[PDB]
Amino acid sequence: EIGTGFPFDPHYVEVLGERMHYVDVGPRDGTPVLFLHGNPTSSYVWRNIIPHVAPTHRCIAPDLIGMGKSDKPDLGYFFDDHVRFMDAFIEALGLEEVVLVIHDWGSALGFHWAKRNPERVKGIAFMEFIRPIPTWDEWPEFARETFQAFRTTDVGRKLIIDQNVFIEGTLPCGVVRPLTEVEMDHYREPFLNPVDREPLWRFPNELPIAGEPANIVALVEEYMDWLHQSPVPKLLFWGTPGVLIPPAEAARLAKSLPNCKAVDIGPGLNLLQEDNPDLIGSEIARWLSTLEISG
Numbered sequence: 001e002i003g004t005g006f007p008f009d010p011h012y013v014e015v016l017g018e019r020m021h022y023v024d025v026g027p028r029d030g031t032p033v034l035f036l037h038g039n040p041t042s043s044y045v046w047r048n049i050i051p052h053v054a055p056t057h058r059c060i061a062p063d064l065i066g067m068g069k070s071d072k073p074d075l076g077y078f079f080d081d082h083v084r085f086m087d088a089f090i091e092a093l094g095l096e097e098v099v100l101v102i103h104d105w106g107s108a109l110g111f112h113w114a115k116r117n118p119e120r121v122k123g124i125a126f127m128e129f130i131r132p133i134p135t136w137d138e139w140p141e142f143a144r145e146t147f148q149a150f151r152t153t154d155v156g157r158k159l160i161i162d163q164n165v166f167i168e169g170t171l172p173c174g175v176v177r178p179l180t181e182v183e184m185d186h187y188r189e190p191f192l193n194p195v196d197r198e199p200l201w202r203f204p205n206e207l208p209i210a211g212e213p214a215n216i217v218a219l220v221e222e223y224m225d226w227l228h229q230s231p232v233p234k235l236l237f238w239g240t241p242g243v244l245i246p247p248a249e250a251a252r253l254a255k256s257l258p259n260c261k262a263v264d265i266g267p268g269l270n271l272l273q274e275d276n277p278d279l280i281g282s283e284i285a286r287w288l289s290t291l292e293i294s295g
């Protein structure tokens with residue numbers, strides 16, 4: 001059975017005049033493990049993975065600005081904004097070296113931070129991550145029409161802001177197993193107020209698809225280029241059929257990325273953590289152990 005509870009004391013830190021919430025558990029010494037969620041989730045997505053890692057490592061899991069229990073300033077919530085606030089978050093906790101565990105838009109943040117801070121990243125575990133999507137044919141068929149509608153301002157905002165489709169529709173459709181009502185309520189909580197749903201709409205409009213938006217495409221291409229030339233230890237989780245990362249792409253990346261271990265979690269779409277948390281957690285913990293082995 002998969003846990004529905006969120007048994008983590010809230011921690012808060014001031015970041016650029018706002019307050020961000022984060023999970024902070026595990027020993028106080030050693031290399032911390034920073035967990036970064038994406039759209040439309042929160043640190044909640046890591047709730048059943050962290051317990052595998054916390055016995056040996058500090059686990060830090062922030063809620064992105066505008067999401068989870070973090071503050072909700074009147075921003076456009078561009079990727080730029082998230083980058084700014086996450087940089088400031090990392091510096092506010094005085095983190096030096098880290099291991100990254102990243103997912104979805106959290107992966108874009110993680111890879112972009114790593115590229116710019118290569119000496120401070122001691123390993124990256126990732127799953128269903130942001131890469132350039134050259135054309136719409138390389139976006140999953142079943143979600144193609146939806147995300148094309150998301151990527152408009154009248155109808156997309158109607159769907160995502162007014163009707164909360166990303167939470168009620170897209171979110172559970174990103175999990176093979178059914179989310180329980182308790183789980184749904186945790187994911188719903190930060191967005192009960194419609195006006196707070198801005199990040200949920202901007203994020204799919206920031207996705208690097210078919211060359212647009214060009215700035216994001218460029219940035220993502222840059223950190224993928226960096227990732228392909230980096231010797232940093234890498235752990236890739238993938239599922240079938242996946243969403244951002246289909247099996248063929250995972251198979252390619254497992255070989256093209258230096259020093260990369262790949263793990264098949266079985267059936268999965270986007271929120272792999274919700275379909276097979278125990279395997280992901282366990283493999284991350286053991287893989288973390290292997291990072292201390294010289295060979």
Ligand SMILES: [Cl-]
Pocket residue numbers: 039203204205207
């Ligand atoms: Cl998105």
